[PDB]
Design a protein around this ligand. Structure first.
Ligand SMILES: *[C@@H]1O[C@H](CO)[C@@H](O)[C@H](O)[C@H]1NC(C)=O
Lengths: 223, 214, 200
């Protein structure tokens, strides 16, 4: 079972440095070339750098030439990518992969990938606001309700409905980067209008980077 | 420094169909092309290498062909797991370059969007900013237009929308458009409406609400 | 007719100890002899036995000017390329059959003969080439393949690849990637004495 595991990802300010590691198991780096491929949110794949483990020869993409440096260690059987003078354009999910020889072959095994965010903004906790179901909702129809997460910068966020009890008719939209530099997304669910008064609905939001976990209940306005 | 032009950019087809995807290289690359598949939130999975060589543990329906400098990836019959994005990649001349990408979506009958409007919470008003949300869920095709109208006046520059991926079971899209503005500017107007234009709609829908009423 | 009764050396080819690499496929000329083709098919110990331009079923009645037995090793997945009008690394860069091919193509698995613990790297194939191969052409050159604009000066590296690469004939491999021995019988018919014939 060949395996490639990434590490060293995180949050860094513009112009900073970050070292990504890629540990390999189930095979020897010898005779292989380790590559780093990055993918910006909702965009294509872009090759960055590559290295022949045995000889030590390296190759870089024009966009990151000079700033990034790729290395490898045969005893540790791991590959590294030092990233200096980072820019906002470099924010992306970084994967490490392997290929046989200097070229001509595909990438057999990829790591799961690590997210790298480059922003001047600081890590902030999410603000949770309810989205109550409209009072004027048809009885035969099904009223919709939801939770809104605003102003959290570190992208990773998880949401659940009733501690995982509601797994049907739920739609959690992807986050959007605001002009302020903080992220904001919303999650919604469609439930029958009759069960609005009877049942109780809770959105559970977890922000691992800032270590902020909260829950909020949704109820009609009534006024 | 070779450029790989991939077509089609997007493709919609039904289960059991035969699909073809093409990648043309700027220069000759011998047979150093490879084809990968990527699903949301997952690393790319290698499908084909050296143009026409199957990878271990990969369904036999996937095939690869090379005619001159044109490369082709073919699916004999589609299966629900084959709905994902597909890339081509060349490893002939460095820097290695991927294709633009080809998204494959499950075809579905036209459906109209269920549209809802959510006013800003009072807890948010305490902070000083008001966010109005407009949700339109369970519709197909992806193409849709959302227009924010405040007292029948179009609002531009303060709206942001996001779209979900096709539902596992519904096979339909959903969209959420948020309009954020300061409490002072929010209190200046009284009517807030979210006009929606879709292919599967005779006329534009217009869910709205009035500030200070429930 | 030959006017002499000398069995042809087919055992030398099919039962040879070691086979050649597909990039340098071996070829044995066969003339001035007689041999029973149908014995091969009857043996039925082969996995692929496809003939183009002639019926395989007991067609020893025919006599040919010369015969050619071409032998090499490839993967199982690649066997499908050893036929007329096919494309692939093997067909393009290693061993090409003409579209007007009259002959037979025989292939059998050899995992026990051509596998070694930790891999057998004795069987190579050509991976890079500027142009496709003409039919029945052989290229044994080992010159470094220059892919970039810069010259290579005979050194291995990025954009400077050694043209031949080794098969990963692991013993734990799938059938598609297991070694397979291939013999291609070509029947050269010309306006010349028939030096090869069938029995009797
Ligand atoms: C290969 O060897 C076996 C046993 O010696 C024999 O029966 C078979 O016919 C041989 N192949 C040929 C072409 O003679």
């Amino acid at each position: 079972e060949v395996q490639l595991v990434e590490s060293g990802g995180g949050l860094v300010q513009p112009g900073g440095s970050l070292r990504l590691s890629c540990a390999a198991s189930g095979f020897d780096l010898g005779g292989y070339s380790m590559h780093w491929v990055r993918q910006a949110p909702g965009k294509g794949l872009e090759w960055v750098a590559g290295i022949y483990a045995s000889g030590g020869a390296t190759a870089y993409a024009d966009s990151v030439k000079g700033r990034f440096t790729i290395s490898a260690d045969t005893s540790k059987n791991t590959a590294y990518l030092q990233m200096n003078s980072l820019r906002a354009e470099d924010t992306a999910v970084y994967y490490c992969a392997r290929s046989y020889y200097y070229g001509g072959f595909g990438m057999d095994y990829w790591g799961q990938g690590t997210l790298v965010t480059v922003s001047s903004a600081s890590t902030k906790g999410p603000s949770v606001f309810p989205l109550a179901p409209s009072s004027k909702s048809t009885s035969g129809g099904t009223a919709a309700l939801g939770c809104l997460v605003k102003d959290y910068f570190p992208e990773p966020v998880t949401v659940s409905w009733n501690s995982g009890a509601l797994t049907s008719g739920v739609h959690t939209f992807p986050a959007v980067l605001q002009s302020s530099g903080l992220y904001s997304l919303s999650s919604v669910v469609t439930v029958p209008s009759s069960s609005l008064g009877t049942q109780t609905y809770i959105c559970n939001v977890n922000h691992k980077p800032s270590n902020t976990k909260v829950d909020k209940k949704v109820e009609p306005k009534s006024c | 420094d070779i450029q790989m032009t991939q077509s089609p950019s997007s493709l919609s087809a039904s289960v059991g169909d035969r699909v073809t995807i093409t990648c043309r290289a700027s220069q000759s690359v011998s047979s150093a092309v490879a084809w990968y598949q990527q699903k949301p939130g997952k690393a790319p999975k290698l499908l084909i290498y050296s143009a026409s060589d199957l990878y271990s543990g990969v369904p036999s329906r996937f095939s690869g062909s090379r005619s001159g400098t044109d490369f082709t990836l073919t699916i004999s019959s589609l299966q629900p797991e084959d709905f994902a994005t597909y890339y081509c990649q060349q490893s002939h001349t460095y820097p290695i370059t991927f294709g633009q990408g080809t998204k494959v979506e499950i075809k579905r009958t036209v459906a109209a969007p269920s549209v809802f409007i959510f006013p800003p919470s009072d807890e948010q008003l305490k902070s000083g900013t008001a966010s109005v949300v407009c949700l339109l869920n369970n519709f197909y095709p992806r193409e849709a237009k959302v227009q924010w109208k405040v007292d029948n006046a179009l609002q531009s520059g303060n709206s942001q929308e996001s779209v979900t991926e096709q539902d596992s079971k519904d096979s339909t899209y959903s969209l959420s458009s948020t309009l954020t503005l300061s409490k002072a500017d929010y209190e200046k107007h009284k009517v807030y409406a979210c006009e929606v234009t879709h292919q599967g709609l005779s006329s534009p829908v217009t869910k709205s609400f009035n500030r200070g009423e429930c | 007719f030959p006017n002499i009764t000398n069995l042809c050396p087919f055992g030398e080819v099919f039962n040879a100890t070691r086979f050649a690499s597909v990039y340098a496929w071996n070829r044995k000329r066969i003339s001035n002899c007689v041999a029973d083709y149908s014995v091969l098919y009857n043996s039925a110990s082969f996995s692929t036995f496809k003939c183009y331009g002639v019926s395989p079923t007991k067609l020893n009645d025919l006599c040919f000017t010369n015969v050619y037995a071409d032998s090499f090793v490839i993967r199982g997945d690649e066997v499908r390329q050893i036929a007329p009008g096919q494309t692939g690394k093997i067909a393009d860069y290693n061993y090409k059959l003409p579209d007007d091919f009259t002959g037979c193509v025989i292939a059998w698995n050899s995992n026990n003969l051509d596998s070694k613990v930790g891999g057998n790297y004795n069987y190579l194939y050509r991976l890079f080439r500027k142009s496709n191969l003409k039919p029945f052409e052989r290229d044994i050159s080992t010159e470094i393949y220059q892919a970039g604009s810069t010259p290579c000066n005979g050194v291995e590296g990025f954009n400077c690849y050694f043209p031949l690469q080794s098969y990963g004939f692991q013993p734990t491999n799938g059938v598609g990637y297991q070694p397979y021995r291939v013999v291609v019988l070509s029947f050269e018919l010309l306006h010349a004495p028939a030096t090869v014939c069938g029995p009797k």
